[PDB]
Design a protein around this ligand. Structure first.
Ligand SMILES: C[n+]1cnc(N)c2nc[nH]c21
Ligand SMILES: C[n+]1cnc(N)c2nc[nH]c21
Lengths: 542, 543
């Protein structure tokens, strides 16, 4: 029938997550033989025939083999725990094989997690062989230098009933380094580079340990810091100059040396340092942060997430001017974070009671809406929208004016991500996090900009909804991940992101929903709208 | 061209009211000769022509004669004051003539208002013919049907009683003519005249009695005991109240009276105290009751009721039945009136007599299973009565709503009453733009109910439907510019713009629902105590 097609159109588009109708699950089977139509169908297909054990399986592998080629995201689902079978893993891996390197890089983080899934036998035999997914990751790590660095750092962290999963990761990392040694010139070139990175990290850790060990005023500890860096050959490789190393946090950039005098130390109780590095070429300086206190895996997942969303949005050709900095954690309790010149909002307010005066110093225009360049305002509005919607989907907690930073450009971003998926020290939300100052920085509900802001939020939300599947699959693979917040309710953890997505709603409904949350959050923050609500309560009483 | 049609379809649906048309009328004209596509087009076509060239008028006139015939609702615009010219007005009347009596009756109230616009010399000449076109039309029809005669008579009578000076004389002449046509006419015309005479005499005695009751010192009970005695006292008055010669009730000509039961008569709580009455019906003793108010001008409440009745009619046509109750008012001459009495209990009474609304439905209609041990239909009718009213009071700007002021019925329905404050006039400083007591929201089961969600959904569909049918509502309001309805009279012009603004015709539907959703959200948050606290916590989070 022609109508059944609309109901099929329904199933291929709607879920990445359906359990629904393990009775209808075979109606698809009946029309699929002809409607091996397009890519998406196949993932849905595999979910049901597999439940029954045996003769259908052999028929299904043929069916799959002949099926229109799968998109990559299906493959991420195929690598998940749900399907145990090897051929489908093989198929999923051939899809990744088709994927370009940059794509692996984003996905890559989960793929390392994906290794936890079978088969150990595939791992044991490769290991036994020198003394399928794992094999593929290694080969492609060896093809690309940047890829190899990230692969290495992720494995080093996993090795640093989960004891058996550790064991496996250890075997996989060690093989990887061994193939590089046995390597032809370029592999070995990468290998030596990895060894060089590590040595350096270990030296910077040792310096930090010794900086922490002296009790002090913050200034005293910066003074001490500058002296240790300046001081030569007490530390295996001098810090004021060393052989050029490609930054571990960013492979593309090489570093010759740090600069001591430039380094300043952060207000946070456990104190990360800003360091200045020099690029191998043209004496560019790179500024990074080196944090000593906590495991950064959580911050980095969020950052990968943001990156993904921005990418899709830009592929949408909405640039919300998201400013997603790279984060890498070396070990649990050391990491590097990109640094972008920025002022924390609270700082701005101490420096200036208003954000607009703050912009006014940097990009003033006379016919400009407010004494700001029109384009700055637009960029500010967009960055807020993007970030409200992203935090929302991600259910980020603990926002405060120290947490959100502003650039002279107007981009707005969030710095610190200790609380994910709604976890929060405080007892209530708001679900949408906006300072009063930021809404006044928009010029309030009356203003035209604020309306543009709201408008952007909805449309961003609508788009992300469309690419539901990628985010859910990536998360599907963070269950066993060791992010503190996932670990508490891991099973539940995937559902929370999907709840925020509200995929159940038709679009108009979805926009309405987000409008709702916007209204609550804005009214709460503004003092004038709170007073108006009180007059309305007042009205029914008498 | 191909798109031009679309700009024009946009012009045709969107407003009936707009002065918007400026260049558009000139481009539209070129197309008028080629396509009188639609009935709607005719109203749009009419707008451009008359002021300028007189010959231009001849061309437009020929155009209209063969033009796709106008819908009755649009015709009303024509009787409206903005269009002076005699030939178009004749056309409006011809369109009304085709209309069936019931639709004709619903509008009847406005026509009397419209009567003001037709030139008096047209009316003076008709008077001239009898004593030693629309006005003729109203009388001709008023005569053909008794119920129409009755309504026409009461509306005119209210108007006749002492700028106003010229309009009073006009109405008086029309009435005198209508009465002379009936006495003169045949049997039915005479029959109508006789029944009208009975109605008139009956009310007057009814009024004498109410006046005696009011003088008497005492609280309500002392006064009701007194009222009970007078009806029962035969022969104090011209009419004997315990029995009479049957009279068509002014509220329903369809039903005669014949009796009143003194014992059944009560009075209400409200400030000037209306009696209930009962009568027998002319047939098999079935009672009727109505109310009867001694203390103000009902005109405003009747317009509002006409408005609610019509809106309900439109929604039923769509097939939304929100179980509205559009009870009947007529005024008599201002300061008496009647109102149909529907059995109901005011919410405040319901809360005191039974702790909460849920308990109240539960006692009358209890089914252990669903949803609240309250039979489902009742819940559904309560949800629907609720949606229909917030939307309708909101469009109409009904204000001064209180618990004393809404009612329930055993059946579930909710409705309003006593529309003294209209069009955003309020005795208080604020809205809320939507009127929901907490008591009512709890009745729904609060924010997450299938039922509360159901109510919001019902409101949205209702809003959109009314949005589509805006043309009729605006035309009727335009017709009561000169209304002598207090709230409208404060600024006559603003009244029409205010109902229109509430309408949100500019917005796209997706936006319109967002706009309505917004108004509902502030209104419910302020009403519920938990939500206010949630907001306080959110304020607390930041600073
Ligand atoms: C400027 N900046 C950028 N990224 C961070 N993670 C950060 N923390 C403090 N300041 C910061
Ligand atoms: C109780 N009651 C019922 N129906 C009415 N129309 C009315 N008006 C005031 N009170 C009322």
């Amino acid at each position: 029938a022609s109508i059944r097609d609309q109901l099929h159109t329904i199933v291929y588009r709607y879920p990445p997550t359906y359990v629904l109708s393990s009775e209808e699950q075979d109606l698809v089977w009946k029309f699929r033989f002809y409607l091996s139509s397009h890519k998406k169908a196949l993932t849905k297909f595999l979910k049901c025939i597999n439940w029954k054990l045996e003769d259908e399986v052999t028929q299904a592998l043929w069916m799959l083999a002949n099926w229109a080629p799968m998109d990559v995201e299906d493959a991420l689902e195929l690598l998940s725990p749900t399907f145990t079978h090897p051929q489908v893993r093989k198929y999923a891996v051939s899809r990744l094989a088709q994927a370009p390197d940059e794509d692996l890089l984003l996905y890559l983080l989960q793929l390392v997690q994906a290794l936890k899934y079978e088969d150990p036998r595939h791992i044991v035999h490769l290991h036994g062989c020198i003394f399928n997914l794992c094999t593929f990751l290694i080969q492609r790590a060896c093809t690309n230098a940047t890829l190899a660095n990230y692969f290495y750092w992720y494995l080093s962290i996993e090795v640093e009933q989960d004891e058996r999963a550790h064991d496996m990761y250890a075997m996989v990392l060690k093989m990887f380094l061994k193939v590089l040694e046995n390597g032809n010139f370029n592999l070995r070139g990468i290998f030596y580079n990895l060894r060089k990175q590590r040595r350096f990290i270990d030296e910077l850790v040792k310096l930090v340990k010794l900086v922490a060990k002296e009790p002090g005023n913050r200034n005293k500890k910066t003074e001490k810091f500058q002296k240790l860096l300046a001081e030569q050959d007490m530390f295996k490789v001098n810090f004021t100059n060393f052989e050029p190393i490609p930054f571990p946090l960013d492979p593309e950039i090489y570093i010759t040396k740090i600069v001591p005098m430039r380094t300043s130390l952060f207000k946070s109780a456990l104190m990360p340092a800003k360091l200045t590095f020099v690029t191998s070429i043209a004496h560019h300086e790179y500024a990074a942060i080196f944090k000593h206190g906590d495991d950064l895996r959580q911050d980095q997942l969020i950052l990968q997430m943001i990156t993904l969303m921005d990418k899709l949005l830009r592929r949408e050709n909405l640039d919300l001017k998201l400013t997603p900095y790279k984060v890498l954690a070396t070990s649990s309790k050391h990491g590097f974070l990109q640094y972008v010149d920025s002022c924390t909002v609270a700082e701005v307010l101490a420096r200036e009671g208003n954000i607009h005066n703050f912009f006014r110093k940097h990009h003033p225009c006379d016919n400009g809406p407010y004494g700001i360049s029109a384009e700055v305002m637009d960029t500010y509005i967009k960055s807020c929208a993007g970030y409200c919607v992203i935090t929302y989907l991600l259910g980020v907690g603990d926002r405060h004016l120290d947490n959100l930073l502003l650039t002279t450009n107007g981009k707005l971003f969030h710095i610190d991500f200790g609380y994910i998926l709604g976890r929060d020290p405080k007892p209530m939300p708001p679900p949408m996090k906006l300072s009063k100052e930021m809404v006044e920085a928009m010029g309030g509900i009356s203003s035209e900009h604020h309306h543009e802001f709201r408008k952007q939020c909805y449309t961003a939300y609508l788009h992300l909804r469309r690419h539901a599947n990628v985010m859910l699959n990536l998360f599907s693979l963070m269950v066993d991940a060791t992010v503190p917040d996932i670990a508490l309710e891991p099973d539940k953890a995937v559902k929370k992101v999907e709840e925020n997505l509200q995929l159940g709603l038709t679009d108009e409904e979805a926009v309405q929903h987000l409008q709702s949350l916007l209204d609550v959050s804005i009214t709460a923050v503004m003092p004038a709208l709170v007073e108006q609500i009180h007059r309305f309560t007042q009205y029914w009483r008498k």
